[PDB]
Amino acid sequence: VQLVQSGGGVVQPGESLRLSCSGSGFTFNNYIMHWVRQAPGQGLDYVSGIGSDGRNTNYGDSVKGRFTISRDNSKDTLYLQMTSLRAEDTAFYYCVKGLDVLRFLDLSTPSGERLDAFDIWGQGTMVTVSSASTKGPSVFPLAPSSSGGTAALGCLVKDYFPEPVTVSWNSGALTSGVHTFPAVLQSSGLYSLSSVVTVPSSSLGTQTYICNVNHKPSNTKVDKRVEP
Amino acid sequence: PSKRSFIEDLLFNK
Amino acid sequence: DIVMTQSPSFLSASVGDRVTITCRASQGISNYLAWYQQKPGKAPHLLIYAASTLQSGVPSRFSGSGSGTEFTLTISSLQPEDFATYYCQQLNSYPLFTFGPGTKVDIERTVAAPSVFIFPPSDEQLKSGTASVVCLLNNFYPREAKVQWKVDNALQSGNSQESVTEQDSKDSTYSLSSTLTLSKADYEKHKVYACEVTHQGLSSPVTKSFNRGE
């Protein structure tokens, strides 16, 4: 029993995107179906809901008039049609199985062993709305300068779109003390990421440290040696 | 016109 | 619609501690309230519905209470799998539902001060026409930390960005990375670049600085 989502990706503002949610293992025709979105680092926000027959729909105020929810019961699939997309619509989108209205009493007066609602969720779909275009990252070293026998060094992965980037140290040989931070979205519309590692100060002369940054969307692979 | 259909009409337009 | 609030936003507890999370509704929702758990990389899964009723398969340590405006979620003894974010959901307006902002529970630890390191812009980046100064706060607990950038003693605002890692699985600490972004011209106009760190582990705020070009 599962909800499997398809679609999503990176689109420019004003373009349209369609999300699909396919169900199996439950009687799709009986339940209200919902769409929920979670912006990065934020809470869960209501998007839209559709009745079992499809005649009834409700929407969040932010998406009303721009978003349309639809279902094809013959294929056990839920759809969200997103138009005039804005940067604010950037979020991780979830489809959730809702309540069969014949069991509305369960919300306030539970009658069964379980609540037959909000029990199945989709895996989620990332939707990023940006005017930016695919750009490879610039990799800059964070050189170890002149603490307690341990020195900090790292790499600055800057001005790349879109997510994600993978950062490894010494081709995966160095993993202890490595901290790869979450990227931040700059006002330019490009992401910037930092990766640091703490190493013994004595090792700086002997051991060479290289950060390996792979950006699959731009096919960019940069290996940058960080020298003292 | 099932009962589930009308109850959804009542809840969505309540 | 109905606005749901949760206090506190962040919570620290040890394994074996008792955790109580609060949810408040802007208007009376009777017992039309559910509780959810979300862990990073996973969808939220239902714990409690009708304020006090446990969903099937949910451990007995979770319990819920309240009717009307004020609601409570209680984990009698926190278990290692319990560290996560907890959301309340009002169902009074179903088919419309709204969530609370959430309470995030992380593992409690002895206070650990951050190790602060400042990294000047690389020579490679400076040729490109921009200067990025990176300040690293390593392995601190708790997560609350203030980084203040100072350029020739002038407090900087709006030209810095920071991000925090998730709590380390081994030592349960946090690390913070802050980046100050300036144009090469603005970078070359000033000499002293400082990163001021305020943390509970520090008796006084710690400043790490460098002179441009040294």
Numbering used by the authors:
A (entry chain A): 2 to 147, 151 to 232
B (entry chain C): 812 to 825
C (entry chain B): 1 to 214
Question: What is the paper's account of this structure, in its own sentences?
Answer:
Using SARS-CoV-2 S1, RBD and S2 proteins, as well as 15-mer linear peptides covering the entire S sequence, the specificities of all seven Group 3 mAbs were mapped to the K811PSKRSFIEDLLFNK825 sequence in the SARS-CoV-2 S2 subunit. All five Fabs bind to overlapping epitopes in the fusion peptide through interactions involving the heavy and light chains. The conserved residue R815, which is the S2’ site of proteolytic processing upon receptor binding for membrane fusion activation, is engaged in electrostatic interactions with the C13C9, VN01H1, VP12E7 and C77G12 Fabs and therefore buried at the interface with their paratopes. In contrast, the C13C9 UCA bound only to the beta hCoV OC43 and MERS-CoV S, whereas the VP12E7 UCA bound only to the alpha hCoV NL63 S, with low affinity in both cases.
The coronavirus spike (S) glycoprotein attaches to host receptors and mediates viral fusion. Using a broad screening approach, we isolated from severe acute respiratory syndrome coronavirus 2 (SARS-CoV-2) immune donors seven monoclonal antibodies (mAbs) that bind to all human-infecting coronavirus S proteins. This class of mAbs recognize the fusion peptide and acquire affinity and breadth through somatic mutations. Structural and functional analyses show that the fusion peptide-specific mAbs bind with different modalities to a cryptic epitope, which is hidden in prefusion stabilized S, and becomes exposed upon binding of angiotensin-converting enzyme 2 (ACE2) or ACE2-mimicking mAbs.
